[PDB]
Amino acid sequence: KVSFKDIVGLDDVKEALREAIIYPTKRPDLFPLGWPRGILLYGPPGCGKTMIAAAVANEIDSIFMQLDAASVMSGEAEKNVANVFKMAREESKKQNKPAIIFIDQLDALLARVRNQFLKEMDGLLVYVIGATNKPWRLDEAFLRRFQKRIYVPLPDYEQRLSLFKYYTSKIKLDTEVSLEELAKLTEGYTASDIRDIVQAAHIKVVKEMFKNNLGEPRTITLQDFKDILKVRMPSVNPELIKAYEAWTEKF
């Protein structure tokens, strides 16, 4: 689906994931002591943690299994938690392939099932990349099963420019629209935020097309985007970012 070349920026993140899974997977011999299977991606939501996990899977040519912590939470649903790991081990043996269980919203597993999960982790020493928008909520005992913890931050200028270039590639822009200006004006927003902003501008012009019974939409202008930015605000708070920075600092 995707790989490191498709990902713009995030140097440090790529490096970390090279240390945690990619290198150890290509050359297990250079890691004789045995090396973590727990990986924790954390940061503000709509920042591409899933994309990152899938890319990692792609680079080591792994099996990818996505899991939502809110699906298995709904008790006897406890057994399925082991269902997944089982399937993973078995498939791994089967195809001569590493396996990756990706869990979104890991903090959701936090009363009985959580215990089995942690077991299944301990049975690891197949990788588990968990992802959380709320890492605090994770208690120390849980956080001990993930030794490698990676902070995926808000998109920077280069990335936001990449996102605008992607999302607008297929729609008509005014010849005066600078993708660079959009990137600057979007400091603080998320990847999802950018997607939604572009979708908004597009809808706006489509609504006009239908209303004025034109068979075509007018070019999206810079003012359209500015109006939208006046109304819509970062879906993540400046203080939440700090809350990430002090937790990462916390360890």
The site for Cl ion (CB under 5 A) is made up of: 47, 49
Cross-strand bridge partners of residue 127:
100
Q: Burial, 110: exposed, middle or buried (Cβ in 10 Å; 0-12, 13-18, 19+)?
A: middle
Record the tokens describing residue 219, joined without a space: 């070019």
Query: Which residue's structure tokens are 């959580």?
Result: 114
Q: Which residue is nearest to Cl ion (CB)?
A: 47
* Closest CB 104 distance from Cl ion, rounded Å: 9
* Closest CB 168 distance from Cl ion, rounded Å: 22
Instruction: Answer whether 13's CB lies under 8 Å from 150's CB.
Output: yes
If residue 137 lies in a helix (H) or strand (E), which one and from where to where?
none
User: Of 10 and 63, which CB lies nearer to Cl ion in the complex structure?
Assistant: 10
* Closest CB 52 distance from Cl ion, rounded Å: 8
User: Of 16 and 47, which CB lies nearer to Cl ion in the complex structure?
Assistant: 47
User: Of 14 and 49, which CB lies nearer to Cl ion in the complex structure?
Assistant: 49
Instruction: Answer whether 62's CB lies under 8 Å from 26's CB.
Output: no
- Distance CA(106)–CA(55), nearest Å, equals 19
User: Of 199 and 235, which CB lies nearer to Cl ion in the complex structure?
Assistant: 235
* Closest CB 116 distance from Cl ion, rounded Å: 26
* Closest CB 78 distance from Cl ion, rounded Å: 27
Instruction: Answer whether 226's CB lies under 8 Å from 194's CB.
Output: no
* Closest CB 171 distance from Cl ion, rounded Å: 25
b (16+ CB within 10 A) / e for 64-76: ebebebeebeeee
User: Of 20 and 47, which CB lies nearer to Cl ion in the complex structure?
Assistant: 47
User: Of 47 and 65, which CB lies nearer to Cl ion in the complex structure?
Assistant: 47
